Design a protein around this ligand. Structure first.
Ligand SMILES: CC(C)C[C@H](N)C(=O)N[C@@H](Cc1ccc(O)cc1)C(=O)O
Ligand SMILES: [Mg+2]
Length: 353
């Protein structure tokens, strides 16, 4: 098959509520939605959802880059994902959201051409994924109350955002555990807010609160400090901002920096690159959690879920971006409904539109 044309459009969707993390706030999911059409008529959908305080990418920059990529892959076979990434990598030294947008659309096309759900093409380990739901930074009693709400919706794993100071961060977790009890799994995410010593201190202070894992406790570049935390606590430590791509992953495995790694299609440039990170991690005995940017919609989330369902080593999931969307840009895929279970159907590719 051959790519005939590539179209992209801006999508700006308000979130039901501003989300606060240690890095800042997000109130609108602004993404680039791409449609790749083949000469035979098949259409693939992709998306680039950039998180400025994570990668620095912007919607305007992502749109321009996708157009450059699009005009360079005309005539290529979607299955030649190897050449498609080579072409994009030669065009741009860094544009994970734009690359993911193209990459996702190609995988959607592969699935449609093969007449198979994407999760079958990517590994076939399962046809669904169970996701947690993240609670944004707020006052202890508020977060605790929202925690009760989410658990009533059926969520058994909650991702707690922290990072305004260990004193308050500790109070947030205690209140949450106290409110929902110990039957719920609680994972913390500090989005780089703590120093290596404060991190150890906070984690130890929460020893009796049954913490599943702590995500990116220190600054992204502080790998010595991240490792310090990891080698100082029995609590599982996960890297997020410290790991963008396969190259970063190889570096972390080499140094024994963390216990688990957070994979985001918008950080690595798509499914093709994400698979590399998981293979490297799996070989090193490092499990992976599939994550997401708040700026992504059904397209990005559905793609991530198919990859997570497909791969055995991607044992955790944090795909809750759609739960906060006011509207859905396309039909099909993971819905806007706030629910832990994301069941992927039998529809070919992403099962979108
Ligand atoms: C609201 C949900 C989708 C947040 C998601 N689970 C998450 O925590 N993502 C990042 C943090 C983040 C990225 C981008 C934006 O705009 C806000 C927050 C993470 O730290 O895992
Ligand atoms: Mg994180």
């Amino acid at each position: 098959m051959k790519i005939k044309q590539v179209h992209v459009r801006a999508s700006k969707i308000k979130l039901k509520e501003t989300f606060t993390i240690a890095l800042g706030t997000i109130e609108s999911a602004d993404s680039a939605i791409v449609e790749i059409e083949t000469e035979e008529g098949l259409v693939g959908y992709g998306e680039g959802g950039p998180g400025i305080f994570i990668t620095g990418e912007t919607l305007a920059g992502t749109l321009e880059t996708i157009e450059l990529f699009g005009q360079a892959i005309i005539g290529l076979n979607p299955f030649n994902i190897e050449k498609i990434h080579e072409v994009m990598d030669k065009i741009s030294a860094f544009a994970p959201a734009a690359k993911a947008a193209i990459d996702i659309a190609c995988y959607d096309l592969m699935g449609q051409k093969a007449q198979l759900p994407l999760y079958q093409l990517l590994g076939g380990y399962d046809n669904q994924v169970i996701t947690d739901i993240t609670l944004g930074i707020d006052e202890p009693n508020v977060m605790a109350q929202k925690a009760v709400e989410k658990v009533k919706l059926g969520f058994d794993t909650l991702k707690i955002k922290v990072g305004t100071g260990i004193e308050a961060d500790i109070a947030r977790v205690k209140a949450i555990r106290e409110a929902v009890g110990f039957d719920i799994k609680l994972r913390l995410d500090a989005n780089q807010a703590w120093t290596p010593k404060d991190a150890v201190k906070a984690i130890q202070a929460l020893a009796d609160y049954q913490i599943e894992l702590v995500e990116q406790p220190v600054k992204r570049r502080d790998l010595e400090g991240l490792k310090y935390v990891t080698s100082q606590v029995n609590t599982t430590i996960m890297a997020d901002e410290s790991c963008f791509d396969a190259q970063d992953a190889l570096e972390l495995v080499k140094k024994g920096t963390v216990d688990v790694i957070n994979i985001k299609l918008m950080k690595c440039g798509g499914i093709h690159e994400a698979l590399k990170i998981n293979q490297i991690c799996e070989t090193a005995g490092i499990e992976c959690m599939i994550g997401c940017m708040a700026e992504e919609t059904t397209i990005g989330i559905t793609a991530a879920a198919h990859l997570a369902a497909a791969q055995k080593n991607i044992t955790r999931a944090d795909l809750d971006a759609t739960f906060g969307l006011e509207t859905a840009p396309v039909t099909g895929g993971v819905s806007l409904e706030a629910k832990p279970l994301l069941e992927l159907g039998e529809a070919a590719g992403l099962g979108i539109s």
